[PDB]
Amino acid sequence: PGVFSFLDPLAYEIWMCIVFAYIGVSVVLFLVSRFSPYEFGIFNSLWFSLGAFMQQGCDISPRSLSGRIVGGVWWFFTLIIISSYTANLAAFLTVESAEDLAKQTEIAYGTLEAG
Amino acid sequence: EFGIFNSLWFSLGAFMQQGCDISPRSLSGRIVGGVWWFFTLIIISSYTANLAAFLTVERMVSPIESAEDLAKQTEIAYGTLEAGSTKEFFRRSKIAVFEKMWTYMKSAEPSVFVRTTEEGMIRVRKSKGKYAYLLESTMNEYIEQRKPCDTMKVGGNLDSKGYGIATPKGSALRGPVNLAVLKLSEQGVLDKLKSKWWYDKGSALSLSNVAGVFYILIGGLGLAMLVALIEFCYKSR
Amino acid sequence: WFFTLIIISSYTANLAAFLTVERMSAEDLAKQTEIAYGTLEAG
Amino acid sequence: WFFTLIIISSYTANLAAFLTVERIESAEDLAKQTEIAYGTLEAG
Amino acid sequence: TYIVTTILEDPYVMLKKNANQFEGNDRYEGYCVELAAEIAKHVGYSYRLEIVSDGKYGARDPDTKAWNGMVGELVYGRADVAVAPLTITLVREEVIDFSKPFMSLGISIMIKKP
Amino acid sequence: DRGIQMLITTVGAFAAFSLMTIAVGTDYWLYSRGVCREEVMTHSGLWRTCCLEGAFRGVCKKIDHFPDTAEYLLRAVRASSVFPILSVTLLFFGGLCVAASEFHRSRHSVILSAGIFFVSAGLSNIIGIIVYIS
């Protein structure tokens, strides 16, 4: 077993890039929402992006064309990643020789002396 | 509140199951949202379920390790060299697996057999995993040790035998050749020749699986920044 | 909400099993009885 | 929320494994397994 | 001079790179070439490496009962020795004599490694 | 706290540019077993892969990126390393605007363009990482 085995379905690289994408999405959503004609602060954007990625929603939503493009793609990225995690975990929960031991040399092999 | 812009936004939000700022209130509007919600539930569940089947049967595939167990058990069209000891071994076999293999090989069309070892080697290399040239372990090992090293020996040896120096029956060279082979074997000559001509020749989903959805997200972020600048110039003019 | 959560999960799980399963003789004819087998008469 | 997302995906993933896995024919089937014990009549 | 039948097979017997510059038994290289040289040295005879014409190792056609390839070349008298990777088999031992094996092997499966 | 706020921007803009321009120049991106010329532990980068031990330790060669337009475009992008280079170029332009903000306070667009450049540089850095991993 493993303590943090719940991260096994997705590789460590995917988890790192999800964090980077979440930081980038929040900064861009804060930027386009602030300098636009028509409460998306920097902190509100991080709360919205964390809720949007985790399928829990938020009390406030984007209202501008440029802001809604950021929310739309972030939602789509969320659906593919969350579905990928569930599908790969289901495969994991559903489902080796002497030649293997002879071919390698990392595991030391010996004999009896004077035999 | 349900203009053309918000209707597109509400529909997209409902399909991604991320909720929306407003919900339809009229009976006519709530019917459209109701079937769209049901449509989203069936499609997204279908996508997740099909991906699970896609990544299970991809696992649980199994290599072969002497698939001869079920012989070809598939389109790995296994063949042999024509007029060789291997073909004769399969023809005269009485072991269940080998008899099954022979009955398949003799009747299979087109002929699984080949005319030369090079022909079988190229047949496996150009069948892209569709041919298997049951051949002698020595040749198999020599080939697998040379480029284009895209071929590999699977499992153990089906039997044990050896090459001999032949002579016509009743030949006077029979005795001297036997003694010569014993001398060459005891002096390490055969070992050196073998070593010279054979040895001296010499899981989690990856980012590549979901790399497309990262390009879309960054491409979407860049487009939104360009759109924002356009509205800035349009509003300020 | 609890009824919805279990039912939606059941639908997705059973559909995954449904799609996975299909992705994966003379004695046989004699043992069964669902298929009828015959010959030519006076042959 | 994170505890919620991981657990529910675990429920769906494990239930799919439960429903799929669950789904004799020969001499080998008995010889090959060891969960079912098979015997004969004595002095027969 | 004895005629030693052989077959083209890497790396037992091979045509040397630019074999045109050479002629006769010296046109080839490989394990069996050096083995034939060493056997000839020990036995004390001269030999010419003739490649089998059929390009087949050897088999008795069940219909005609004719041996083809190297075994046929040996039985009918056209060759005096065979120094190819010729497997020792019961059917062949009934019609030609074999020395002690000079190499071990078995039937094996080859699959595209890709 | 505008004075401290501008101090953070000036310190960060130089720090971001220094960190990214060092990564592109250095060859310690990946620790993988390869051959510089027997397979031995090697440390690679965006341009050269170099052995960590062995007789040829310290001497190394240029990465051969090239040995279905999907693999052609990805390898051409990865070979040229334009995305990691673009992030450094964007950071350099973003750093220039921050410095010129004090020297020209009449226009307010100088410090907003700097904020846009750093965000664009960070986005290009994410793409360069994904292309490198792929």
Give the DSSP per-residue string, F56-78: TTT--EE------HHHHHHHHHH
Instruction: Give bridge partners of residue B168 from the DSSP assignment.
Output: E96
Is B45 in contact with C15 (CB distance < 8 Å)? yes
CA atoms within 13 A on the CB side of B103: 7
Interface of B with E in 104-123 (CB under 8 A): 115-118, 120-121
Give the amino acid at E69: G
Task: From chain A, pick out residues whose CB is under 8 angstroms from the CB of D7.
Answer: none
**Every domain of chain F and the residues it spans:** 2-134
At the second CATH level, the architecture of F2-134 is Up-down Bundle (1.20)
Bridge-based pairing of strands E81-82 and E2-6 is parallel
**What residue in D sits closest to A83 (Cα-Cα)?**
D9
What is the C-alpha to C-alpha distance for residues B217 and C43, in angstroms, rounded to an integer?
73
Instruction: Give bridge partners of residue B114 from the DSSP assignment.
Output: B81
Looking up tokens 């939602």 gives A75
Which of F116, F120, F130 comes nearest B211 by C-beta? F130
What is the C-alpha to C-alpha distance for residues F123 and E84, in angstroms, rounded to an integer?
66
Calculate helix-pair angle for A42-53, A12-34, nearest 10 degrees.
140
Calculate helix-pair angle for A65-94, B4-15, nearest 10 degrees.
10
What is the C-alpha to C-alpha distance for residues B35 and B29, in angstroms, rounded to an integer?
11
What is the C-alpha to C-alpha distance for residues F11 and F23, in angstroms, rounded to an integer?
18
Is B19 in contact with B13 (CB distance < 8 Å)? yes
Is B222 in contact with F123 (CB distance < 8 Å)? yes
**What residue in C sits closest to D11 (Cα-Cα)?**
C9
What is the C-alpha to C-alpha distance for residues F77 and F130, in angstroms, rounded to an integer?
11
Tokens standing for F56? 């040829």
CB contact under 8 A, C12 and D8: no
Instruction: Give bridge partners of residue B132 from the DSSP assignment.
Output: B78
What is the C-alpha to C-alpha distance for residues E80 and E6, in angstroms, rounded to an integer?
11
Distance from CA of C42 to the nearest CA of B (A): 32
Question: Cβ-count burial of B88 within 10 angstroms (0-12 exposed, 13-18 middle, 19+ buried)?
Answer: buried
Residue B110 preceded by cis peptide, ω within 30: yes
- Across D14-43, b (16+ Cβ under 10 Å) vs e yields bbbbebbeeeeeeeeeeeeeeeeeeeeeee
List of residues 6+ apart from F8 with CB closer than 8 A: none
Phi first, then psi, for residue A11 (nearest 5°) are: -65, 160
Q: What is the signed CA dihedral for F46, F49, F50, F56, rounded to 10 degrees?
A: -160
| CA-angle at B44, arms to A71 and A18, nearest 5° | 45
Dmax over CA atoms of chain C, in Å, equals 71
Q: Is the dihedral of CA E60, E61, E67, E71 positive or negative?
A: negative
Interface of B with D in 53-72 (CB under 8 A): 56
Which H helix or E strand runs over F42?
strand F40-44
Looking up tokens 């012989």 gives B71
Bridge-based pairing of strands E28-29 and B151-154 is unpaired
| CA-angle at E89, arms to E83 and E90, nearest 5° | 135
Q: Which chains touch D (3 or more CB pairs under 8 A)?
A: A, B, C
CB contact under 8 A, A14 and B48: no
CB contact under 8 A, B215 and F119: no
Interface of D with C in 1-44 (CB under 8 A): 8, 11-12, 15-16, 18-20, 23
Q: Is the dihedral of CA B58, B64, B69, B74 positive or negative?
A: positive
**What residue in B sits closest to F121 (Cα-Cα)?**
B222
What is the C-alpha to C-alpha distance for residues B1 and E85, in angstroms, rounded to an integer?
87
Is A31 in contact with B225 (CB distance < 8 Å)? yes
What is the C-alpha to C-alpha distance for residues A46 and B177, in angstroms, rounded to an integer?
86
Tell me which residue of E104, E59, E88 sits closest to B88, measured CA to CA.
Answer: E59
What is the C-alpha to C-alpha distance for residues B81 and B196, in angstroms, rounded to an integer?
26
Which of B207, B221, B222 comes nearest F130 by C-beta? B207
Write the DSSP assignment of F84-123 as a string of letters. HHHHHHHHHHHHHHHHHHHH--S-SHHHHHHHHHHHHHHH
- Across A10-33, b (16+ Cβ under 10 Å) vs e yields bbebbeebbebbbebbbbbbbbbb
3-state secondary structure of B155: coil
Sequence-ordered alpha helix ranges (H) in chain B: 4-15, 27-56, 85-91, 96-107, 117-126, 137-144, 174-186, 189-194, 211-236
Phi first, then psi, for residue B83 (nearest 5°) are: 65, 45
A13 interface with F at CB cutoff 8 Å: yes
Task: From chain A, pick out residues whose CB is under 8 angstroms from the CB of C13.
Answer: 90
CB contact under 8 A, D5 and A54: yes
Q: Is the dihedral of CA B190, B191, B193, B194 positive or negative?
A: positive
Phi first, then psi, for residue F34 (nearest 5°) are: -140, -160
B207 interface with F at CB cutoff 8 Å: yes
Give how far the C-alpha of residue F23 lies from the chain's centroid of Cα atoms, to the nearest Å: 6
What is the C-alpha to C-alpha distance for residues D34 and A84, in angstroms, rounded to an integer?
37
